[PDB]
Amino acid sequence: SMAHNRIRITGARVTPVAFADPPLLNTVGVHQPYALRAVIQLDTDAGLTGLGETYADTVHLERLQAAAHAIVGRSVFSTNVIRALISDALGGDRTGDGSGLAGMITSASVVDRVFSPFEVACLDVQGQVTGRPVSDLLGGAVRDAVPFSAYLFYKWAAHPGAEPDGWGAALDPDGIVAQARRMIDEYGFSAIKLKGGVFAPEEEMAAVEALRAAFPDHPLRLDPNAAWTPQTSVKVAAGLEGVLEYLEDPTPGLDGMAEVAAQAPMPLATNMCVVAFDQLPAAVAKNSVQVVLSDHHYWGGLQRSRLLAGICDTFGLGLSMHSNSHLGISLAAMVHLAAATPNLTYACDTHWPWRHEDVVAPGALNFCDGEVQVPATPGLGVEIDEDALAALHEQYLRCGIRDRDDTGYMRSIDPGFNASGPRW
């Protein structure tokens, strides 16, 4: 079947999709009523198709098309070469670019964000053709299931002029505790994270303490997306001594983070000031953070995430995982990666509970007691449901949204709104 023992790329089909998202609040705005993703179907001359998933902003879709064209005629095992071809096609790397990430995270490598979904799709094909799960291409699983956290948000009851969702509003500690109960009853999550930077620090600390009261054994994390000054951060950290497993991005920039970490009794984590390999040396020299949140979508795929993990282990940094609104292809890739990473022991973030649509056939990624069992089948372990894919693509065409824009969407509701920060 494989002439010249060769299996190479013949093309890629990129399909933007949109799925319903509740009005989740963050420090820069509120989520739009649909979240956008792009599905990559990477086709080969063996007739095997690999899957990847990434952001769907306008400029990213154009880059994905240029990447797809550049890598036709390359072996799916030649991922080093494929990254270099993509770099050439994009005209090299670059920073200050926040696409797909709502301007929230603006320092990630453009080449890595574009390469990522193709690399994941390549590993999926490698696994299919060898009969091995993707975790076997990353040094093999070290655990049979991957634990995730409950990702809590302050939220309105409904998007303006729309039916309220089944969650209800969460705008204070009682509302946050109620949301946690509903989510944890359904999924079994053993660790809990709160998206903060929305209400005054003392009110978010109150929600944290209420969570601790309701869930005495659950590790807790708080993430205000850099909404605080370093002085305010140090007060929050002192006040939450012994309560948080870690505190993520309390304040903006490597210097401010280093200032806070010098006083904070819990470790600081980040997915804002360390989002690319070239930021690691400064973060290490300054002692800005103690925990790095991996994310294969912007670090450049699964093998490069494994590299990040080894760098963290070497330099004495803890390792967790960051997420954005995502579907089942991303989830499968996250699970294979975390399963194969010895030092990824923190529960991974996921936005899973907040969506109810998907592009893959069901059954391969069930949550049980807060964890997802790593698929043992060849490849990524999930397959496209073409009817579901077409439906979410049609939803994307109709919903009219073309870029993630939490701030712009908040402004369409509240014209004078600014994404100020820090706010406290």
Q: Using CB under 8 A, which of 160, 239, 265, 342 touches its own copies?
A: 342
Residue 162 touches its own copies, criterion: CB under 8 A: no
State the binding partner of 271 from Na ion, its own copies, Cl ion, none, CB within 5 to 8 A by kind.
Na ion
Please identify which residue in the block is written with the tokens 């978010």. Answer: 204
What is the Cα–Cα distance from 173 to 195, expressed in whole angstroms? 13
Segment 232-261, which members bind Na ion (CB under 5 A)?
A: 248
The active-site residue, picked from 31, 60, 159, 195, is 195
Q: Using CB under 5 A, which of 271, 279, 294, 341 touches Na ion?
A: 271
* Closer of 102 and 340 to Cl ion (Cβ): 340
State the binding partner of 142 from Na ion, its own copies, Cl ion, none, CB within 5 to 8 A by kind.
its own copies
* Closer of 50 and 224 to Na ion (Cβ): 224
Upper half-sphere CA count for residue 59 (Cβ side, 13 Å)? 11
Residue 95 touches Cl ion, criterion: CB under 5 A: no
Segment 147-176, which members bind Na ion (CB under 5 A)?
A: none
Residue 132 touches Cl ion, criterion: CB under 5 A: no
Q: Using CB under 5 A, which of 78, 95, 106, 373 touches Cl ion?
A: 78
Segment 361-400, which members bind its own copies (CB under 8 A)?
A: 376
* Closer of 91 and 140 to its own copies (Cβ): 140
* Closer of 44 and 270 to Cl ion (Cβ): 44
Residue type, 288: S
* Closer of 56 and 121 to Cl ion (Cβ): 121
Please identify which residue in the block is written with the tokens 């990129």. Answer: 14
Residue 345 touches its own copies, criterion: CB under 8 A: no
Segment 259-298, which members bind its own copies (CB under 8 A)?
A: 277-278, 280-281, 284-285
Total count of residues recorded for the chain: 424
Residue 46 touches Cl ion, criterion: CB under 5 A: no
Residue 322 appears among annotated catalytic residues: yes
Residue 407 touches Na ion, criterion: CB under 5 A: no
Structure tokens at 45: 């001359």
Residue 81 touches its own copies, criterion: CB under 8 A: yes
Task: Single out the residue of 19, 84, 78, 13 nearest to residue 52, CA to CA.
Answer: 13
What is the layout of strands, in order, in the sheet containing 145-147? 145-147, 371-373, 367-368
Q: What DSSP line would sit under 56-96, residue for residue?
A: --HHHHHHHHHHHHHHTT-BTT-HHHHHHHHHHHHTS---S
What is the Cα–Cα distance from 344 to 418, expressed in whole angstroms? 36
Residue 231 burial (C-beta neighbours within 10 Å; 0-12, 13-18, 19+):
middle
Residue 163 burial (C-beta neighbours within 10 Å; 0-12, 13-18, 19+):
exposed
**Phi and psi torsions of 414, nearest 5°:** -140, 85
Chain breaks in the chain (C to N over 2.5 A) after: none
What is the layout of strands, in order, in the sheet containing 191-195? 149-153, 191-195, 220-223, 246-248, 268-270, 291-294, 318-321
Residue 195 appears among annotated catalytic residues: yes
Residue 72 touches its own copies, criterion: CB under 8 A: no
The contact set with Na ion (CB under 5 A) reads 223, 248, 271
Q: Which residues are catalytic?
A: 195, 322
The contact set with its own copies (CB under 8 A) reads 2, 5, 75, 77-81, 84, 129-132, 136-137, 139-142, 277-278, 280-281, 284-285, 303-304, 306-307, 310-311, 313-316, 340, 342, 376
The contact set with Cl ion (CB under 5 A) reads 74-75, 78
